[model samples]
Target chain A: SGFRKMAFPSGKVEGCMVQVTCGTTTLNGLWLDDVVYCPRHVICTSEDMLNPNYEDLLIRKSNHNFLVQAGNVQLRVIGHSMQNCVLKLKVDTANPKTPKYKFVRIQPGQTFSVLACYNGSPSGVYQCAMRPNFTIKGSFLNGSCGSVGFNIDYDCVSFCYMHHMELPTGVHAGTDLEGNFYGPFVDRQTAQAAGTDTTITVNVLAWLYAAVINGDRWFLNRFTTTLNDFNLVAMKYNYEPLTQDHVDILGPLSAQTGIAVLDMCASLKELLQNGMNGRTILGSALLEDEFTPFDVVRQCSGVTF
Target chain B: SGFRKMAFPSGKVEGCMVQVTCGTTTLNGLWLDDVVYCPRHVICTSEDMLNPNYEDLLIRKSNHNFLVQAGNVQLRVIGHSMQNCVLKLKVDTANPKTPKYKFVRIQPGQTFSVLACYNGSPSGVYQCAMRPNFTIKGSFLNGSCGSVGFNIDYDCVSFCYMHHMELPTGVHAGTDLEGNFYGPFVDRQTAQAAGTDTTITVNVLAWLYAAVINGDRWFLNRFTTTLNDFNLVAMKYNYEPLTQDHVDILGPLSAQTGIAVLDMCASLKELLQNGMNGRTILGSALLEDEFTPFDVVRQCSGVTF
Candidate 1:
């Protein structure tokens, strides 16, 4: 017995509707070569289709539905030798709200960062974020496409926000693990005038990462978002003080990915490692996506200046 | 480390609500002894809670929450070593619709038959049916007790129905596997006189069971409810002629379990074994609960005359 995989003539990706033989496994076997370009169906060839004695042969694609002699009972569809299929994944770019993983036919892919988020152009939202711990690695099942799995945070770049602000007679941001006051630092009469808070709010994952990487893992056990981890993701402007427009864009921790995609680890390494000790993180500059500075303060947002 | 499971006092089963420490597990660890008697809680103590060298201990039931020193990271709660806790599961006797498995604290248990159905007294509904393939087996998760899993067919008792029935010259029910006529038997005139039909309608599961138990496994692969298996489950009422009331009660296959709790195989064995060849199922006497024959005709109503 032999196996056959169906695909479009490359450009015909938008046409044929893919059908699931049973369960969630689709007839379009592999993802690397972008198999199943057009909608098609698969059928079991014989009653003894699962005989181990059948030869593993690869057949050329024909202009019809796929037929398989099959192998193991667990085998849903058949295929011969090959990987590197044109891999593709899906996301509801048009969804105004969060979209679920719908396999309408589009598959999600594996990326380097497990819980990262990505953004499209500023005009429209081409954003995707991985649900934390959404890890799966295997064949067509789960989230894995071939060997890779889907990750919105495929990039390790990000931005942080500020909170807990007040007038300064040498003011502070928030408290830390030992309940030590983490403020009473530099005052900007201008920031005070802007009626803004500079307490940096970051994703809890950021603190989680820092703790694990620096062997301060014990802190994680006692970590409380209402306390120590708050304002841990501090950022500072390179040349100027915090502005009103920047204050508008940077708020609490968010799921949206920002522009000015810089190296996350290298950009905040010095600040993260030292800031955990309850000292003020010397502010760093905001990143600019391409156009300007307030955008940098709004986008780079990974510091304490 | 020592494990302490929370439970209610001897008399108090309700009042305090159970809390999920994380995931779906409750602090009422072991279910056999019916642990977690009341609305009590459990506390995690010490940083070295996972200390492998710690001794395991059980504590007496106290007035307050139970506490655990800790063990495997996978272990959601701590239980000292005994089994047989006050086991319980929940169902909405009050639910007007199908109820979901709400661990509001009640746990569903494993019974003899995997895809079984259960019913309560005639006054109200205490019926429970398992969603197909809802097999889960671990500790307190996936509908399992300490060891046993849950099944509605835990009793292995059931009933059947009738459909596709029509009046005939000699009289027939419907078609069969070979597409041959399955009718043309004696006149079910009494049934016809009452404007009734004797074509039995039964759950596909009944037909599935017959095929598996009789070693007609191939039937399962090609089995189509629309064809051969449609009227495969035939039944007849013995002693009396088919009556209008009997026709009214026996309907198309249903999810409802009937009252007459009898041996399923022993009752239907004779007919199932030979009926595959499209022979008539001689009517069997109806079952009764404690009431009478119609109740048996209604309840114990298993098969052919």
Candidate 2:
């Protein structure tokens, strides 16, 4: 028997045996009548997937959200089904092969976090995802229930913050019932005007993680000094400071980030000479995407690269 | 007419009529002989021209040392002949067409300053030379006495300090008996260990000049915040706190420096990523010539870039 494409008439296929055969050999067979299939997958519906509220029921129930802070990462279980579920998370970082696994009991509407580095030493892509299908009997569950995975990769080169819910201005909090929240956004306009880059925010968040979270003033100062010097270079030419515009353009290197750090001075010098003076001043300039640490970290944590 | 090479064995040639004939064309006739030539040309002596004492009498007796500071340049008449010598100093900058001329009555071992910018406004090379032959009666003196000329160029990008005389540490003053002194190399080793770049020192000096010299705190703070942020970026990864090393790497930007104001960030980032992490960690880092604001200002003020 060979594999055949089959469909249910009422846009719903339920309770049928799934058989696999190749060239008269019955390779495998499974009885899974409890599964339902619909051609118009709700996940693929033309609605904002990122938006907290959408009409698509399946997406609302299954989508998992990931957020990156300075050093650690938070995984959010979105929608109704995430509640009352025991989550088995598989975390694979710079060292992907020997992934660390953990289990957590979740209440209705909650975000979970683990003590792990996103950037910094062992400075590589820190990744973590939700591993579905586990039973209360300490054995793996059979079949897949459209397992929702939260994938995150982070490097502690810069400060990065991601917010799923907008909080009160100047209010900063960690894990809570509504999900992970971090920010003052106090310097948003100032930073934006300065053409501030999200990398700065990422680095700042990293510093905050070390300094505030870990209580390392020495670490914070080191970061501040670098920022200070770079700022002086930036303002000497009347340019905005602390910007991703500079990072994307300068491209400093680290374990995960592509640009080499040492070469930043020379790169910046060149930008000052050629880009800012020669072009930026004469009305021609490079257009940069404006973003926040939260958004940038959110994005980086969600994807592979 | 043809060019002729003539030499006076007496090392003195005075008041002689000379005529040139090229193919019998009688190209020109001129009266000379007031000129005196000696093997001991002061500027030509092989002894270190930069050294105040190098056993070369001619150099010690006639060299005029030019030094750059924040707002003005000082011309130091190093040796004996500078006393009572009427100097018509002509200063030319990037704008060469309109030169600024000033007259100074020199005293032995005295340093002279003129109110002209070395780094700020219309920034480019600043050149000043001792114009010979102007008398107190506003008359011109004839003949060549080998007038010492000084040329200078500067940019506010970095702090550089050059010392002709090494003094006791922590001694900072202006116009001491020996020469003009500037500094307070207070954070040398700390800055050095932090991996400070001369560019940062240069910028710090520039800022000090504008803020301390001109008494502008608001202006200084605006510049400082940018520096502060940049430092944070540099130190966030290393788990270190803020220090001069971040400044040392950024290097800043300026006009007379000719590098450009906007480009320093990338260059610094690269230097940190590649130069510091790659070569520096291998025990062979880039050897940045350590300097202070005082020495840096002095050197930039002294020569045309």
Q: Candidate 2's fnat?
A: 0.00
For candidate 2, write residues B165-250 as lDDT tens digits: 11222111111111222232221112211122113223333333322222222212212234565556556433123345434432
Candidate 1 per-residue lDDT, tens place, B166-231, comes to: 232222121111112223321122333222322222222333232232233332222222212222
lDDT of 2: 0.22
Interface RMSD of each: 34.3, 42.3
Q: Per-prediction RMSD in angstroms?
A: 31.7, 31.6
Write candidate 2's Cα lDDT for A35-75 as tens digits. 11111112222233233232334343332321111123322
Model 1 interface DockQ: 0.01
Candidate 1 interface CA RMSD, Å: 34.3
Best by lDDT, which number?
2
- Which runs of model 2 end up more than 4 angstroms from their true locations? A1-248, A251-305, B1-51, B54-57, B60-305
lDDT per prediction? 0.20, 0.22
